Structures are given as C-alpha cells and as structure tokens.
Design a binder for these strands. Structure first.
Ligand SMILES: [Mg+2]
Ligand SMILES: [Mg+2]
Ligand SMILES: [Mg+2]
Ligand SMILES: [Mg+2]
Ligand SMILES: [Mg+2]
Lengths: 354, 143, 49, 44, 19, 48, 92, 95, 98
RNA sequence: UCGGAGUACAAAAAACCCUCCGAGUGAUUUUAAUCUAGACAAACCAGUCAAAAUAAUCACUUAUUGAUCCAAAAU
C-alpha cells in the first residue's frame, strides 16, 4: 500500500539522468551549509522544530515602538562607499594587514553599534531573557534610545548595567546613575522592575525604584513615585532579573493611586504589573530604552529582611523528583540482591513484635 | 504576624536564563550519529564567507544570542580587508566584549579538523580567551 | 517489648532481671538446642522507654 | 604485623613507581624508534 | 515506511553512482 | 600459532590482573592498569 | 550565639562568620539532623555537628581550603563582572 | 525427594539445594549466577559484573525449592553480624 | 532486532527505544546510543519520531565521501528518535524561614 | 552447537535430509576500571544495552564458543 507525497519530496528536483554533468559540492562545508538551509524551512512532515517548542513559531508582533529613525538610502550608501575608498586606498593599512598587526578602537565600535543595529541586539537579547513575555506579554519594542545604568562601588569604581550582565546586591544597595540624551521639551518616566521573585503571586513583580516627569537628562528633578529599594533575592533561588525601562510621556501625567509612601519598605505596597500600569497611561507613555541585569543572593541581602522589612529570611532549595521505580514484584526474577533496598521505606531494622 | 511575612512553599522562578547559569538545567545529550554535538547551552558558530567573517553565539533553540558580523557598518568602517586574519581576530575581540556585556562567560566551540588547524581560527580563539570568555561549557549538575 | 512487659507487670523492675525472668513472663522464647546463645537488645522503643 | 608488612610493601613499591614506569616508557619509546630506523634503513 | 507519504525520504543511492 | 594465558602482577601488594598474550609476541606484556588497594594507575608486569 | 559563655569570644565571633547562613534574626544558631527514626541518634548527630563546628572554629589552624571544581564558575563570573566593574568614573 | 524416611518416618531434605542457595524469610530464594568462576579473561568487564552478582529465583523455582527443603531451613534466624539480616522482610509490597 | 517503543509512548530514563543491526533509525534529541547500536531514553518523557538532515562527522570518511559526490541541490535525510522531556528539571521549595 | 542472508515482501516470531554463504579466530595498542538507576530478551540456564555516582579498533563484525561437579593452582 503506497501513499502519495504531500507537496514536494525533498530531492526530487535534480535529474538522475546524466549525473556526470551535474555540478557537485566537493566540500564537506558547502554541504553543511545547504543542509542547515534545509533545516530552516517548514517541511510538511513531522520535524524537530514541531515537537521541540520553537516557542509559538510565527508570532504576529504587537509592536509598541518608538517609530524608526528616518534617514535617506542613497546618501548613506554613497558616504559609506567613499569612506571605504579612502580607507582601502591607504597603503599603511595594507602593510598593517599583511604583517598581521592591527587593532580596533573598541570604544568607537561601541559608539557605532550603539548607532545602527545595536538597538536590535538589545531587542533580541531582551527576547532571549523573556523581558517581553513577563512585562508586555504579547509585544515587542525596539530600544531606540541607549540607556546607561551604573553603581558606584567605591569612590573610583563604577559597575555598569548592560543588558544581561551579572551584578551583586553589594553594588545594588545604592541608587543608580543614569545617562541618556535628549533636549528638554522632553518628559520622561523611568522604571525599575523585578520580573520574578514575588513570593505570593507567581504572575506579579516588584518595582524597586520608579521615577516620573523627568525633563531632559535631569535625573533628580524627576518626581519619584517609588524611592529606591535595593534588589533582594532569596538564598535558594538564584539569579533574579532586573529591568530598566524608559517611557516618553507627551503631556505631564500625575497619578496618586500609583504614588506610594515615602519610606515604603512594605512588600504588599509594591505589587506590580507592567501590563496594567501601562494600560493606564498608554496613550501618553511610549516605550524607549532598555538595560537589565542578573542578580543572585549575596550576604548583604541578610541585612535587608532583618533591618528593612521586619521579615524572616526565606531560604529555598532545589528539589529533583524522587527516582522512578517499577511496581514492586512479589518474586523479582533475575534481579540483583540490592533490588530489595530500592523499595526500602527508610533505613532501620524494624522488629515488629520482638 | 506581618502581612508581608507570607511567602508560599514553592517558588516560581520565571526567568529562563536561570538554570543554565546554575548549570542544573537540561543539556541536549544525543545525536552522536551526527555532527556537531548539539549538547550545549551556548555554542560558538563561525561562518566564513569568501567576503565576510561572521562569528555568532548560538542557543540550541537555533536563536542566535550575541553576534559579531563584518557586514555591520561598525567594524566594517574601522579596519581594512574584511577577509583577513586581522579581521577574524577583530570580530573575535568584538564578540568577546559583547559577551561580557551579555554577561555570558560560556559557549562551546566545535571547529572542523582542517579548520581548527588554520590560523584565523587560532587567533579567533585567542581573542575570546583574552576577552575573558571561556569555551568548553561547565559540566552539568546531576546530569 | 520490654517497656510493655514491665507495664503489664509481667516482669517487675524491683527485683533483678536476667533471662529467666524474661522467660517466665513469656516475653521471650529461647531454644538453646537451635544455637540460641541468649537474648540480645535493640533500640526500638528508645524514646518510649 | 601483617598490616605493617603490607603497608611497607606499599611504601617501598610506590617509591619505585616513577622509576619503573619511566624506564619502560623510555624503553618502548626506544623500541619504536629502533624499529622505525630499522624499517627506514631497510627500505632504502 | 512503505505505507507513509514520506517513504523514500532517506533514499539516496540513485544520487551517487559509484558502481 | 597459539593463545597464551599470563598472570600480570602489580607493583604494590597482592593485586592481580589476568590476560592473554599472543604466541608470536608482537608487543610483549607490560601494562598501565588499575590497582584497587591504593586506587592508582601502575605498571603491571608480566608473570606466571 | 552572643549569650553563650561556654565558648570564648574568638570562638563565639568566628562561628558567626562561617556559619552565618543558618543563623537567625534573633541571634540563634540553628542545627538540624534528620535521618534516624530514633531521636537519640539525632541528638548525637546535632551535638556532634556542634562539637565539630566548635572544634573547627576553635582551631586557628583552619585554612578553609576552597575547591575549584564547584567554584570555577564563581571565580570566572567574578572576574568577568570585574572587567566591567573596572570602568572608573566617580558617581553620585 | 524422600517424602518418608526409613527410620524416622519424617520428610527428608535435599542437601545439594542447600549448598548452593539461601532462603530468606520472605520466601525469596537467593543464588549465585552460573559460570562466574569460569573463563574470566575471555569475558567483557560488563559480563563479569553481571556474573559476580547474587540473584533472585522466580516463583516456580522457589516453590520447587521449598518442596526439596524441610521446615528447618524455613525457620526464622537471627545471626549476629548477619549480612543478609537486613534483607529478610518484605516492605511496601502492595498486591 | 526492532523497534521497542512507539510514537507517543511514555518512557523513563534508560528504557530502550529500538535495537538494530545497521543504522536504520538514528538517535535524535535525548536519545543515547549504545555500542550495539541501540537507542535508549536519557530523560523521562514522550517518544517522537522525525525525519531530518544528515550531516556526518568529518572523522568518518565513508560518510564524508558520500557527502562529497552528491549533486549540488540535494541533501541527505535519515530517520530519528527523540524524547520530549515531560517532568520539569526541578522545583524550588521553601526549606526554612529564619 | 554458533552466525549472516533468502524461505519470512512492511513490529516481532516461525519449520524442512530447504536454498546459499561463513565460525571453532587472527591483527593491534589506546590495555579497554570500580559502582549502580532503567531496560531488551527470555520456559529455565545463559545472554545483551545502559544515565547519574567514583576514579578499544579492523577483517561483511554479526560467529569465534561449553553448566555443575571434580581436579590443579594463590590470595
Ligand atoms: Mg527463635
Ligand atoms: Mg589454556
Ligand atoms: Mg524481511
Ligand atoms: Mg519482553
Ligand atoms: Mg558516565
């Protein structure tokens, strides 16, 4: 009983008649490539992708963006072309190349990456750690604006927040320094959200520090709704993730329901859903910049719960399911003696009536 | 007591990056008919075109995490002759700093026998070594 | 079992206790012919005692 | 006495580990090059 | 597997003739 | 040709391995093997 | 820990050092044993974890040897967050 | 089997059962795995493991064995030091 | 020889999926290979079968040379077995509140 | 007695004084370890895989082999 192929059958296209006249890949490599090409299309038969959770596959992106920066095509193409003509033309450069000594001014690279497709790397990095899942839930924004966060670790020291990097609450005890650039017609609201680590409510998060109505680059001038509360992970569960977000507001918004007490160390007082808070102010607030860090329990955190929240310190563990053993048999056949100790309740001789 | 004092027994850690850092997570053991070993959390994927060197960092979801490409105007404009050994080293350091920026210290590299011997890749590997990035992903915990 | 036997006053703690007494309370059974060299002690009621 | 005799057997024969292993490694390494130079002298 | 729409997926040797 | 059985002796103690040697003797018998008592890699020598 | 006289002050303060994880907000040092169904062996277990802690802390000769097998990740992530911590601008 | 002795009228036991088996009190019969002293060098380490084991006998074998065995080997036993005393009872068996 | 487990069968770690004389089914994701060319479960879960691309190890010559002579449009495919892991890796529990 | 193909066309199994091929071992070096989840197979006996835990290849590769007892050996 033969069936009929549904759509294309993979190799059918090439002619078996006259194999000698067909070109080959003599290279393991070429093959590898063409192979992975075929690994990336939607085949009509059960495939790895299908079962292994490509995570929803195609998604129609709900996009709340800062609309794309508008520049002209042919202009930049020409300018670039010329810059290259200049560069290559240089003989000093080619001498530097043949003899294999050259270096790249990594800082300038940081600047230009920051300038062109860097905001996209940001995007897919946030998408990597699931920022969109837990915050805006359906949606994708592009970090048009660079957001630079940091902590002074000493008089001379600064530990910055890149997206994704790991930071200690030793450095998270103090308010962060923030740099981004705009003129002042600007109205801003910047948010620090703790995506996971909420004790009672799996679907909810903690806002440590939240600012509102920030003119231009002015940091302290912004009216703070939520004063700064240091990151407080749990001893057991390692590596919470903390997010710095930037919204552009058009008209100054004032919300007293969002406003919190000034000391505010009580944990029920910070209970938060970026979803709902943004549903509120959506028409005014447009998502802009992104930088976030990974943080796990550290000693200083012990000071928090005792000193700050009048709380006991939760400690957690990691529990892997007890191993699977088959229904015990009355007569284990052909089994190692130690089979018996598999089903052992606990280890102790138990003399029932003796 | 305190109204905040409630915790609940079992904690939800929703962040995917977690376990892979804790090393407790699942790798993909397997294949071993085929190549390369798809066992890893993170992999170094270097694609050398006749024109441009593109070195990537991969997740087994097939999604590339952090990438350094020569077609990117940033490196393209700073130095000369895209195909050169100089350029492979370049893209290497770039991806290295970009790695610590991402924060990932660990990815595995599987060169090809004839590739592993070549220079461009030797000094690629040095760019990553001196970047502070480790190849050879740390082993699993209770694998 | 020992706590039991003192509790129901089979073997009384007052006078000394050796094997013989444990026997007479029918609390234990020894078959010497079967290579039984006596009674031995275990910890089962440790906290009970 | 049996215990101390065995343990002294172990001290004595552990002190002699590196010498024996390096001797036979150098020896077999001499035999491989002796057979490679005998085959390269017999093929010419 | 003969009865499937996919039978012959792995089939190759018509592709390289080394005889 | 033939198949010989030889008893290989450890350096340290009474630990023994037991294995076959070829009658033509292409590679004569000395090994680097596992000894149980001191938990070590040693040279096992060919014996009877 | 602070109210216990039967250990000297060097021993009393050095126990708050290594064991600071199990200590409580009220100053109490908590020791736990599980295994034996008879609580006597659990008493002995705990009193022995105690004797151990006081023995090791009352040894100034304790060097606290650190294994590189479980901590290689911690050292390497320490240094790799140290290259970025290394950026120097005076802040606040 | 001798179901009735000559002189005692009793039921005799086979000795060659006893020399090679062991009865727990649960009824599980325990045995060596055959050929474990046999041609070692010729065998893979894996096999060697599988042989050096002690193993259990299926119901058929057990019943059979019981028939060739009198009461006296079915009695309860407390040996000092007994390696196997740990094993004699059944735990958690739900049938 | 033959295929011991089927699509959609639930498995535990170590159960054998298939056994073969020549490679017919290759191990896919989460399926460990024995030296007798057996396929067994490395992780508890569901068994999935799938046809996928064949990209041989360069250490294997014959394989390599099979790749070498192929026409430039076409790719080799083989059948695989995998396990979709069911039980999560682990869980976080509250041990003590100090 | 053991193994490959057909007989047995697609999971398994399957006889014949059925059809055809083989085995009673070579060749090496890299001496291929302890300990244990879960399995295959199976009347029994034997046979096979094998994660975590501690420190063998090539010859179609599949076959290269015998249980108790009894003897000789030492650990
Ligand atoms: Mg009795
Ligand atoms: Mg012989
Ligand atoms: Mg057939
Ligand atoms: Mg079966
Ligand atoms: Mg292993």
């Amino acid at each position: 009983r033969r069936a009929a192929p549904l759509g294309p059958m993979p190799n059918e296209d090439i002619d078996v008649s006259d194999l000698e006249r067909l070109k080959k890949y003599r290279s393991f490599d070429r093959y590898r490539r063409r192979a992975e090409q075929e690994a990336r299309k939607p085949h009509w038969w059960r495939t790895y992708r299908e079962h292994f959770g490509e995570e929803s596959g195609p998604k129609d992106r709900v996009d709340i963006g800062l609309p794309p920066p508008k520049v002209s095509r042919t202009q930049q193409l020409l300018e670039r072309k010329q810059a290259l003509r200049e560069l290559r033309a240089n003989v000093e450069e080619e001498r530097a190349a043949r003899l294999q000594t050259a270096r790249i001014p990594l800082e300038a690279v940081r600047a230009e990456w920051e300038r062109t497709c860097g905001p996209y790397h940001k995007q897919r990095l946030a998408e990597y750690c699931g920022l969109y899942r837990d915050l805006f839930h359906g949606a994708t924004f592009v970090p048009r604006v660079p957001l630079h966060v940091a902590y002074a670790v000493g008089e001379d020291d600064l530990m910055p927040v890149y997206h994704g990097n790991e930071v200690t609450p030793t450095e998270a005890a103090q308010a962060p320094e923030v740099t981004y650039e705009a003129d002042e017609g600007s109205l801003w609201t910047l948010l620090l959200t703790n995506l996971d680590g909420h004790l009672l409510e799996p679907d909810a998060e903690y806002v440590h520090w939240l600012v509102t109505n920030i003119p231009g680059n002015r940091v302290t001038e912004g009216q703070e709704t939520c004063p700064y509360l240091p990151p407080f992970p749990a001893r057991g569960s390692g590596f919470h993730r903390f997010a710095f977000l930037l919204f552009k507001q058009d008209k100054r918004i004032d919300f007293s329901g969002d406003t919190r007490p000034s000391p505010c160390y009580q944990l029920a007082q910070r209970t938060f859903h970026t979803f709902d808070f943004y549903k509120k102010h959506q028409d005014a607030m447009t998502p802009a910049g992104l930088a976030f860090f990974q943080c796990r329990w550290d000693d200083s955190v012990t000071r928090v719960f005792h000193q700050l929240l009048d709380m006991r310190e939760p400690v957690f563990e990691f529990v892997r399911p007890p191993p699977y053993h088959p229904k015990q048999k009355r007569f284990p056949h052909r089994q190692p003696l130690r089979y018996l100790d598999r089903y052992r309740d606990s280890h102790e001789p138990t003399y029932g009536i003796y | 007591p305190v109204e905040n004092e409630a915790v609940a027994p079992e904690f939800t850690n929703r962040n995917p990056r977690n376990l892979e850092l804790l090393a407790v997570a699942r790798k993909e053991r397997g294949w071993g008919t085929v190549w390369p070993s798809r066992e890893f959390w993170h992999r170094l994927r270097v694609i050398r075109t006749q024109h441009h060197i593109e070195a990537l960092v991969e997740h087994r979801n097939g999604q590339v995490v952090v990438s350094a490409s020569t077609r990117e105007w940033a490196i393209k404009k700073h130095l000369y002759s895209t195909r050169n050994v100089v350029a492979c080293e370049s893209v290497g350091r770039v991806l290295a700093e970009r790695c610590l920026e991402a924060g990932i210290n660990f990815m595995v590299y599987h060169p090809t026998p004839w590739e592993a011997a070549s220079d461009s890749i030797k000094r690629l590997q040095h760019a990553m070594t001196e970047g502070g990035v480790v190849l050879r992903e740390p082993r699993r915990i209770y694998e | 079992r020992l706590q039991y036997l003192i509790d129901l006053g089979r073997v009384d703690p007052t006078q000394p206790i050796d094997l013989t007494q444990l026997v007479n309370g029918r609390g234990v059974t020894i078959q010497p012919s079967k290579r039984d060299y006596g009674v031995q002690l275990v910890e089962e009621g440790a906290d009970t005692f | 006495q049996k215990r101390q005799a065995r343990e002294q057997l172990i001290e004595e024969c552990m002190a002699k580990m590196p010498q024996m292993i390096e001797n036979w490694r150098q020896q077999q390494q001499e035999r491989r090059x002796x057979x490679x130079x005998x085959x390269x002298x017999x093929x010419x | 597997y003969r009865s499937k729409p996919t039978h012959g997926i792995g089939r190759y040797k018509h592709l390289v003739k080394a005889q | 040709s033939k198949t010989i059985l030889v008893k290989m002796m450890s350096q340290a103690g009474t630990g023994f391995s037991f294995n076959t040697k070829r009658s033509r003797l292409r590679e004569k018998l000395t090994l680097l093997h596992y000894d149980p008592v001191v938990k070590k890699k040693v040279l096992f020598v060919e014996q009877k | 820990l602070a109210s216990a006289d039967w250990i000297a002050e060097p021993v009393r303060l050095k126990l708050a050092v290594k064991h600071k994880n199990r200590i409580n907000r009220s100053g109490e040092l908590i020791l736990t044993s599980e295994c034996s169904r008879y609580q006597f062996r659990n008493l002995a277990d705990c009193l022995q974890k105690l004797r151990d802690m006081i023995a090791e802390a009352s040894q100034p000769x304790x060097x606290x040897x650190x294994x590189x097998x479980x901590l290689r990740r911690s050292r390497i992530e320490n240094m790799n967050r140290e290259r970025l911590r290394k950026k120097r601008i005076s802040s606040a | 089997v001798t179901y009735f002795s000559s002189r005692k009228g009793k039921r005799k036991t086979v000795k060659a059962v006893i020399y090679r088996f062991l009865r727990l009190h649960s009824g599980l019969w325990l045995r060596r795995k055959a050929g474990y002293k046999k041609k070692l060098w010729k065998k893979t380490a894996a096999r060697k493991r599988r042989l050096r084991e002690f193993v259990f006998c299926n119901k058929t074998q057990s019943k059979l064995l019981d028939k060739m065995t009198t009461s006296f080997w079915k009695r309860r036993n407390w040996y000092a030091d007994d390696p196997y005393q740990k094993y004699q009872d059944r735990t958690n068996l739900k049938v | 020889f033959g295929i011991k487990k089927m699509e959609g069968h639930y498995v535990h770690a170590g159960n054998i999926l298939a056994t073969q004389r020549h490679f017919r089914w290759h191990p896919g994701a989460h399926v460990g290979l024995g030296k007798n060319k057996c396929l067994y479960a490395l992780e508890e879960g569901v068994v999935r079968y799938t046809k996928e691309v064949y990209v041989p190890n360069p250490s294997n010559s014959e394989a390599v040379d099979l790749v070498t002579r192929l026409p430039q449009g076409a790719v080799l495919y083989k059948t695989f077995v995998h396990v979709v892991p069911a039980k999560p890796e682990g869980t976080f529990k509250l041990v003590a509140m100090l």
